[PDB]
Design a binder for this molecule. Structure first.
Ligand SMILES: CC[C@H](C)[C@H](N)C(=O)O
Ligand SMILES: [Cl-]
Length: 570
């Protein structure tokens, strides 16, 4: 009665603050710990590692430890750093199962000497710390003795004292070995997704309640242009596509809960497996190869057009089904592929809907068209330009800006000088929000319009009152259909937001997969069944053409509001 795995591919997720270590003991003198650890770049990309840690005890562990395994340890860390100094904190909690709390002497002080090389670049750091062995807390300050670190200081986390960890009903085996005096040694091996590796070896001496630790490090095989050797690792920040990933995970989690509550697929439960492509082409190909090697046959997601297209090549070649709830560029479904479907519409249709609204209902005097030079935004800007030229509208200029720009002073001064009364922007909320708040600060009265990628609460968060009165194209308000009220209430009961279109397109993708899995487990048979039939969903009855596109899909025109809400424009 094994679970059916479904991959859900998000983008620039935060993820869990706590990470789980699994502890096992093959004999009385050895404890083995296994760990998955992903780092994040300043760019919002993931850098993936796995670790195996070996603890060697001089005297055998007490029988109670050997009878009670495996154990699970939840840990979280904080780092502030310069290029010469590190300030660190760690929290640790042990359990006999996978369910968190849900929301002579033991040690008091310690010192660390950590040294070695990364790609042959030498380092040496020393410093003092303290902690509480009753609750699993520790803190540490480290200073360089050899000047500036010429690699990311994050590569030395988590390596920078399990003598501070208690177990549920008494001392950990680490604490018992320190109190006895005979102690333990540690060896860790880390493997990275680019083929790099790092080893650490530890030795300790106990002077009463004070621990003296020594750690020797050797790292090799890091790419010269990678984030370790360029100092490009950071703590997680919200990024440009986080809003889109959060909507997809909200809709997938509620749909899988509802399906499983009704008995799953002929009694077998669905299990979500989460991945993250950062809407980046190289990360999308790395994710798709991992999904195939993990044995998964069904994928929901790859959200942006520039990441869904390279991923689709890998899934088609390997015989895997892919359903995107969000990618709208026509080229995805224009190449003869048989295993690719959507639960959203096409930018050829979205751009023509915008051009007809401008010609029929707005009738402006002087138009500018702006885009971000990416597949989605530049495609829409070209579709709108063609529609307006056919209607003989006055387009004064057509121009590109750079994605990630925060200073729009040149564009704002040009709109003021050239007396522009209407702008169409093709692109995402981060750039549109900066353009709106900088335009109103400088006294512009211009009417703005954009596509479904700007119609979200992150646009309102960035622009504030400057967002009021923006025109948008987007899918219908599915959250206002009475038949969908039970889903709206279940999402609001978790303090989550059911208003974004990608909640509904993602829920509908899981309902479409469910209908297929009731007929066959084989991806090619599922794609054939959906292309020949109608499926009832939260979006209404869905049908697909032979290339995997929705038949009769319509984008609406709405007024956007500063409170993150959309109303019918007419
Ligand atoms: C996340 C989807 C975005 C907004 C857009 N529709 C694209 O295809 O890139
Ligand atoms: Cl460990």
């Amino acid at each position: 009665m094994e679970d059916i795995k479904v991959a859900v591919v998000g983008a620039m997720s935060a993820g869990a603050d706590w990470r789980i270590s699994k502890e096992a003991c093959p004999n009385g003198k050895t404890l083995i710990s296994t760990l998955k650890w992903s780092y994040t770049t300043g760019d919002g990309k993931r850098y993936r590692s796995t670790a195996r840690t070996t603890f060697t005890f001089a005297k055998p562990m007490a029988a109670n430890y050997l009878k009670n395994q495996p154990m699970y340890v939840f840990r979280r860390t904080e780092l502030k750093h310069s290029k010469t100094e590190m300030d660190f904190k760690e929290w640790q909690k042990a359990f006999t199962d996978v369910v968190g709390m849900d929301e002579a002497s033991l040690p008091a002080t310690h010192e660390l000497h950590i040294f070695g090389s990364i790609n042959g670049v030498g380092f040496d750091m020393v410093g003092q710390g303290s902690g509480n062995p009753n609750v699993g807390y520790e803190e540490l300050n480290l200073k360089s003795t050899k000047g500036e670190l010429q690699f990311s200081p994050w590569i030395l986390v988590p390596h920078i004292f399990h003598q501070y960890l208690p177990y549920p009903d008494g001392m950990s085996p680490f604490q018992a070995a320190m109190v006895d005096g005979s102690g333990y040694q540690v060896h860790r091996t880390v493997r990275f997704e680019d083929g790099a590796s790092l080893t650490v070896n530890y030795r300790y001496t106990y002077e009463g309640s004070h621990i003296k630790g020594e750690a020797q490090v050797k790292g090799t095989g890091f790419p010269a242009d990678g984030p370790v050797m360029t100092n490009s690792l950071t703590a997680f920040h919200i990024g440009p596509v986080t809003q889109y990933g959060d909507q997809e995970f909200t809709g997938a989690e509620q749909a899988v809960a509802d399906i499983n509550a009704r008995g799953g697929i002929k009694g077998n439960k669905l299990q979500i497996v989460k991945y993250d492509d950062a809407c980046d082409p190289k990360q999308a190909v790395a994710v798709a190869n991992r999904v195939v090697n993990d044995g998964i046959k069904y994928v929901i997601g790859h959200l942006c057009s520039s990441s869904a297209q390279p991923a689709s090549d890998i899934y088609e070649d390997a015989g895997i089904l892919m359903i995107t709830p969000a990618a709208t560029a026509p080229e995805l479904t224009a190449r003869g592929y048989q295993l690719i479907l959507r639960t959203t519409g096409l930018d050829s249709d979205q751009g023509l809907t915008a051009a007809k609204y401008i010609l029929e209902k707005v009738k402006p005097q002087r138009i500018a068209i702006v885009h971000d030079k990416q597949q989605y935004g530049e495609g829409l800007a070209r579709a709108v330009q063609g529609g307006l030229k056919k209607g003989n509208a006055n387009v004064v200029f057509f121009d590109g800006i750079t994605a990630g720009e925060k200073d729009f002073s040149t564009l704002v001064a040009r709109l003021k000088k050239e007396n522009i009364d209407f702008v169409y922007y093709g692109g995402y909320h981060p750039e549109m929000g900066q353009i709106l708040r900088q335009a109103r600060a400088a006294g512009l009265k211009t009417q703005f319009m954009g596509p479904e990628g700007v119609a979200n609460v992150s646009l309102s968060n960035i622009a504030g009152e400057s967002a009021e009165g923006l025109l948008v194209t987007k899918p219908k308000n599915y959250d206002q259909v009475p038949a969908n009220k039970h889903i709206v209430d279940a999402v609001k009961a978790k303090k989550q937001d059911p208003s974004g279109a990608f909640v509904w397109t993602t829920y509908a993708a899981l309902q479409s997969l469910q209908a297929g899995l009731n007929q066959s487990d084989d991806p090619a048979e599922i794609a054939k069944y959906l292309k020949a039939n109608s499926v009832d969903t939260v979006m209404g009855p869905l049908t697909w053409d032979e290339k995997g596109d929705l038949k009769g899909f319509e984008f609406g025109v709405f007024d956007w509001h500063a409170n993150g809400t959309a109303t019918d424009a007419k």
